[PDB]
Amino acid sequence: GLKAAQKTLFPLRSIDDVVRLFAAELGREEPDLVLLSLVLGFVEHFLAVNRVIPTNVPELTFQPSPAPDGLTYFPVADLSIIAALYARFTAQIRGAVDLSLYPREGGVSSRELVKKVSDVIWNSLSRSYFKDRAHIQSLFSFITGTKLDSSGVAFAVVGACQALGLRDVHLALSEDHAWVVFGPNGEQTAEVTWHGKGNEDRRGQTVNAGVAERSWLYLKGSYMRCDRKMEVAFMVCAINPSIDLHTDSLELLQLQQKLLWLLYDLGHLERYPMALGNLADLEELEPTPGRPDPLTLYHKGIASAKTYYRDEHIYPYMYLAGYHCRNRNVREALQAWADTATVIQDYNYCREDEEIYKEFFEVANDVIPNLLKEAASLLEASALQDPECFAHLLRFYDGICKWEEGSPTPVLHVGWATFLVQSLGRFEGQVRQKVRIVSGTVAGTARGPVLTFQSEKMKGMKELLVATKINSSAIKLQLTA
Numbered sequence: 343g344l345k346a347a348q349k350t351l352f353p354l355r356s357i358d359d360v361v362r363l364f365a366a367e368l369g370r371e372e373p374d375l376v377l378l379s380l381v382l383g384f385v386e387h388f389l390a391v392n393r394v395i396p397t398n399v400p401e402l403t404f405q406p407s408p409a410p411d412g413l414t415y416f417p418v419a420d421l422s423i424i425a426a427l428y429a430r431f432t433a434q435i436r437g438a439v440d441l442s443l444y445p446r447e448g449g450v451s452s453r454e455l456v457k458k459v460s461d462v463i464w465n466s467l468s469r470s471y472f473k474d475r476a477h478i479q480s481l482f483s484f485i486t487g488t489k490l491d492s493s494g495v496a497f498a499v500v501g502a503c504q505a506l507g508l509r510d511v512h513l514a515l516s517e518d519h520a521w522v523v524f525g526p527n528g529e530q531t532a533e534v535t536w537h538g539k540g541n542e543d544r545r546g547q548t549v550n551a552g553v554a555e556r557s558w559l560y561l562k563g564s565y566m567r568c569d570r571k572m573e574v575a576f577m578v579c580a581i582n583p584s585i586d587l588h589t590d591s592l593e594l595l596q597l598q599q600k601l602l603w604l605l606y607d608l609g610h611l612e613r614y615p616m617a618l619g620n621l622a623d624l625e626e627l628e629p630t631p632g633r634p635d636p637l638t639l640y641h642k643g644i645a646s647a648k649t650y651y652r653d654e655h656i657y658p659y660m661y662l663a664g665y666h667c668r669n670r671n672v673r674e675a676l677q678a679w680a681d682t683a684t685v686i687q688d689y690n691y692c693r694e695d696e697e698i699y700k701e702f703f704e705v706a707n708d709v710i711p712n713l714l715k716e717a718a719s720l721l722e723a724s725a726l727q728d729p730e731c732f733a734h735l736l737r738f739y740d741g742i743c744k745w746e747e748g749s750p751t752p753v754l755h756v757g758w759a760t761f762l763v764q765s766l767g768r769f770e771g772q773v774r775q776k777v778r779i780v781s782g783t784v785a786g787t788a789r790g791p792v793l794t795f796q797s798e799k800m801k802g803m804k805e806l807l808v809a810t811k812i813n814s815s816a817i818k819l820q821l822t823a
């Protein structure tokens with residue numbers, strides 16, 4: 343329930359008031375996920391979902407404040423409103439799950455109980471709604487509009503488990519999926535939501551099969567296993583400032599930025615590489631004085647991935663590659679994309695890994711080709727004369743070819759092939775020839791750029807890629823084989 347220490351910080355008439363609430367709750371032994379998710383959901387609703395202030399609705403009020411170029415109206419999170427919704431949730435879950443009927447062997451939650459709570463959330467949801475709809479992540483959505491996005495279901499199951507007093511059930515995240523972790527050592531996995539559009543219902547099942555499959559979706563087992571603090575972080579990263587496709591709520595941007603700096607300072611993003619990248623993106627738009635540069639943050643994310651996740655994550659490098667791409671840094675962007683490909687090389691492409699495929703596809707056949715086309719125009723009155731770029735480009739295609747190896751479905755098709763030739767061509771033979779494609783001569787040590795191919799496809803083409811004249815026939819045929 344809501345304790346006196348929580349209720350005294352209400353009402354929340356500003357961003358700074360909401361941050362105070364989070365700061366307090368993060369200090370608590372067990373931060374209340376339900377309360378924090380409801381508050382965020384409440385403010386997001388009026389700052390992005392429906393910005394029109396209600397004319398008839400009493401008891402609901404707005405707080406005027408000076409804006410940095412007139413006035414801004416913030417939704418006042420009243421204790422009456424937030425507690426009413428909090429009460430509705432706890433009522434709904436407690437009045438559906440009979441704890442007496444389940445034996446809590448030394449506090450450890452049984453698989454049967456986990457599945458029950460998972461079913462309560464699942465069966466409460468609307469029969470038909472657009473699953474990729476924005477602002478349907480928070481518990482405010484589950485209560486007010488009974489709609490939740492894919493990862494939102496998993497967050498709710500964890501929030502609901504917490505309400506029931508089950509302090510061992512936690513959120514488990516990958517880079518494109520969410521599930522639950524529980525057990526006496528927290529080694530029992532349970533699917534509690536769906537993935538993609540029409541890929542069957544694996545709910546209630548274990549994650550073991552996807553981990554063994556070497557699929558990017560279950561990150562070969564080196565996925566995030568949240569604590570209550572990392573769950574709060576997820577919640578903050580889940581803030582959606584999008585009003586529409588081209589505009590954003592400044593208050594929700596300013597709110598997500600402040601909450602992430604708070605989380606950072608208590609060291610709660612040290613195991614969340616994608617959060618460091620999100621904070622970096624926000625620091626790029628409106629940098630807060632005193633705080634580190636976006637590049638410091640982009641690399642803190644990469645550092646986190648290498649330290650706590652065996653350097654098996656893709657987005658930390660994508661976040662950096664995007665920043666350099668935005669800043670037209672070409673070599674640095676192509677370096678970062680080549681690093682991304684080195685990670686995906688020891689993964690196998692499975693049907694459910696479609697999101698990361700679409701990402702590599704856009705960079706290989708749209709983003710990189712545009713950067714090189716732009717680079718070519720700027721030459722006529724530099725990165726196309728740098729041999730390191732051409733090495734990075736080839737290392738990028740090396741990782742993708744290596745990824746395809748051992749995969750049940752092919753990655754590279756004739757569509758990838760055309761853009762390889764085009765991109766190779768953007769570099770003059772003289773520049774291409776400077777890159778030495780060496781397999782190595784002596785293993786270890788005793789007491790122009792150099793590149794080694796890991797993939798068979800790229801190895802078989804080493805001589806073709808470096809030739810003065812490009813044989814489109816052979817290069818296309820070898821990449822697609």
Ligand SMILES: CNC(=O)O[C@H]1CCC[C@@H]1[C@]1(C2CCN(CC3CN(c4ccc(S(=O)(=O)c5ccncc5)cc4)C3)CC2)CN(C)Cc2ccccc21
Pocket residue numbers: 493515516517518519520576579580616617620657660661663664667701704705709
């Ligand atoms: C923010 N951290 C986080 O955990 O946000 C959670 C919170 C709620 C769900 C959400 C998420 C994430 C969202 C972030 N993307 C990562 C972002 C970073 N990208 C990114 C992709 C490509 C490039 S590029 O360089 O190739 C490029 C640049 C320019 N033009 C073309 C291409 C640059 C940047 C996407 C990851 C998923 C949502 N998701 C649907 C389910 C989910 C599931 C588990 C964990 C998190 C999440």
